[PDB]
UniProtKB/TrEMBL annotation, chain A:
It comes from Shewanella putrefaciens (strain CN-32 / ATCC BAA-453). It comes from the Bacteria. Necessary for flagellar biosynthesis. May be involved in translocation of the flagellum. The chain holds residues 2 to 44 of 460 of the full protein. Belongs to the GTP-binding SRP family. It is found in: Cell membrane. This is Flagellar biosynthesis protein FlhF.
Length: 46, 45
């Protein structure tokens, strides 16, 4: 489990970064956007 | 860097306190569900 700011994709495509790095099960935070910014978080199960 | 323990009634608010203190990039060590809410142990370098 980790929390990452990822990258300023400037596009919702940044979600791909989140998936390729964090995975398919993730919690996205602060997607408040020159580019865009999004901090997401995966948890370690149980 | 450091390692800190966090509590919140919900997982969202616990993730928020981890962000407001450790920052946008951190390592989640623990997400155990404790009586009264959730405990998250996180670390940042």
């Amino acid at each position: 489990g980790k929390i990452k700011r990822f990258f300023a994709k400037d596009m919702r495509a940044a979600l791909a970064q989140v998936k390729d790095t964090l995975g398919s099960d993730a919690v996205i935070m602060s997607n408040k956007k020159g580019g865009i910014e999004i901090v997401a978080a995966v948890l370690e199960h149980h």
